[PDB]
Assembly symmetry: C3
Homo-oligomer: 303 residues x 3
């Protein structure tokens, strides 16, 4: 019933900067201030202070493992708290590597949850199949019981227990998948609706279906990791990796009002806002601005 | 069968200027000239000359009541004429306050009409619940039998007879509603399709449904008040109050070709074009240009 | 199974320049290079060298007949070859006048094909009803058994045998049709889905239906002439004739992945890219870039 707002600023998951400024960007935008005005009660944990291991030299083809891993663990036990104390966590990131912390954190208390992952990418590459060492595209890989020990144990991710299986995760908005990831998602059986599916049925059904899949068997807590990169860049241009032809501002909101409407959202992530990849303020004012109504939409705001 | 084109230039409904230049903007664009070339016969009444009461000091929390009211009455009896003489009125406004004149005018002759209101706002705030004194957001409030004497009689709106009930009005494109208005529309039972509905079913059904609602019982004259502000600002940026994520240029047209296709459009309003709120000509050339094909689309132009 | 890539650079079909640079634009973009990486085998015929007849003085109201006609014939017998040798032709144009060559060429070998024409225009004006002499808008007129000798024989188009009837052609994305063309398409019975149809049912059904029309009776080779002008100009702005409110980048792709998916695409045209009508590189980088994924989408690339 009450929202705790965590700030998990972090760039280490990928090679560009400013991503750790994403949380301050949205707070300056008046997020918490505009959140207070819902039927919900808002507490503000502030931004975590990430422990940076000196020379945590890249492991195999994966950069910054010890700095990211330590960095998630802190997040994990901060989220497992808020949850325990009966509140809904909202993590303002940060790379999408923060999902490993956010979900392990959410899953310790609520271990029956499902994860509806609105991103343009699967973000599911094992430290093996990774092309770009960047862990920010391996989150799901790390949190899937079905892929355990399918990529040599990354150093500092040992605290990590394979949270979730392929049957409790759905992807919406996919349009830029790496072969290997397709090999995984397709061969692992992971349900999903990429841009084409959305095109053939429109979010109306897309949503009607992710629910008849996930909440079908039983109603359970919902964890939603919104990667701001899966909206169309015309909307959220200030991201690190923008692919064209995504969801629209109208579509993003329709996702949030529906998940809101179920009454089971116990966890949300507003990952990827990079206030320094936006040529011009307007572009930035546009990303931040649309990032925020998705948050608010998940908490009551209708049209 | 013949269209009379009235010009009802007016800003008094809201606090910004240039709105009264909207009609000249569309005529300069070649509206009447491009209208002549349809199967229809075009007469051009020219622009009305609005009587401005000296010091019609704001009534309670509502500015310019005596100047707006007088200003509508003239419109009313001009529209009730054209109608009487068997023609279809097209009012180029002007604030959306001109709907009070336009409909009372249309409803005296055709009292069975329905009103399909394509706007981003309900524009239904009683002189009571109004935040912004601006009457341009109280039109519907004034023309609804179901709300009579639910807001103290505004001075100069006495000539106004509660034209229409909650059952003969539909809203399409809503996305920026004030609480009070929601209280009214939701508690009054007013059918409508806000952006989310459009998202869940797409204009195809939206339209299929407003017709199965309104023209269901009997076929009756249709009055359509298109508020240019309910298209997406990417299209009609030169407006006074633009909310994001509205209908699209394709959607606007689909509304007009369908209403056209029914063969019952006896009245239309192209309200809100403000040629001075458009940073740059292009923005203005864009609003005017898209305002005009909506007019033409309602009169025969297909694709 | 193998794709031959022909380059048919040509401007003569219309009065603007740079259109003949369209093929080099897409090759520079890495088309052939990005095509090699599909399950398909890519040969590269290079760009044809078009014979330019000295003073082939305009015939009646139609400019450049002898230069365009000669120019197609060469294309025709180049395409009828590739086909014969069991390969799929891809013509990088060039005006849309190159369809006359491309189809006569495709139809000599595969005479049972159908043509799904994704353009914003019908491009079906007889040398009679033509307003703009420009042949680039008369292609279909020339290749239709049902219109034979319905426009005096243009000089140099005698080699042309009325390939295809009104029952083996469908149009998708229409939104800018000339009266005469409407007279033809509507009176000839030519099936089609203009923007409104797409609006009422969405490409999902549009496609589901062109297939239940064309491939209904029997499965047959598919020739697809994608006119880059029928996407929305926000996407492919660098064209000669852009009308607003077309298909979207998501929609274009949905066409290509479906046609791909049938397994009968034996011929494709990526017509109209003009690298000199794009104010700014970005606009050009945008047209070329989206032109290319449509090509690739037709050859395996999914999302
Ligand atoms: Mn992503
Ligand atoms: Mn409005
Ligand atoms: Mn075209």
């Amino acid at each position: 019933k009450p929202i705790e707002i965590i700030g998990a600023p972090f760039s280490k998951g990928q090679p560009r900067g400013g991503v750790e400024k994403g949380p301050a960007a949205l707070r300056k935008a008046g997020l918490v201030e505009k959140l207070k005005e819902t039927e919900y009660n808002v507490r503000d944990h502030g931004d975590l202070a990430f422990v940076d291991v000196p020379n945590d030299s890249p492991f195999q083809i994966v950069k910054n493992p010890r700095s990211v891993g330590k960095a998630n663990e802190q997040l994990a036990a901060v989220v497992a708290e808020t949850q325990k104390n009966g509140t809904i966590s909202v993590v303002l990131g940060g790379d999408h590597s923060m999902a490993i912390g956010s979900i392990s954190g959410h899953a310790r208390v609520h271990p029956d949850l499902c994860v509806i992952w609105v991103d343009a990418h699967t973000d599911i590459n094992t430290p093996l199949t990774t092309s770009s060492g960047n862990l920010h595209g391996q989150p799901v890989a790390f949190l899937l019981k079905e892929l355990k020990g399918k990529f040599p144990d990354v150093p500092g991710f040992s605290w990590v227990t394979p949270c979730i299986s392929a049957k409790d995760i759905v992807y919406i908005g996919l349009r830029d998948v790496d072969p290997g990831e397709h090999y995984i998602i397709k061969t692992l059986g992971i349900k999903y609706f990429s841009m084409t599916e959305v095109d053939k049925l429109g979010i109306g059904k897309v949503m009607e279906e992710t629910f008849s899949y996930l909440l079908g068997r039983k109603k359970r807590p919902i964890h939603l990791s919104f990667d701001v990169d899966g909206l169309d860049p015309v909307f959220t241009p200030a991201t690190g990796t923008p692919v064209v032809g995504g969801l629209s501002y109208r579509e993003g909101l329709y996702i949030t009002e529906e998940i809101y409407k179920t009454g089971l959202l116990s966890g949300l992530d507003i990952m990827e806002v990079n206030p320094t990849l936006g040529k011009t303020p307007e572009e930035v004012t546009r990303t931040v601005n649309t990032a925020v109504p998705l948050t608010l939409s998940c908490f009551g705001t209708k049209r």
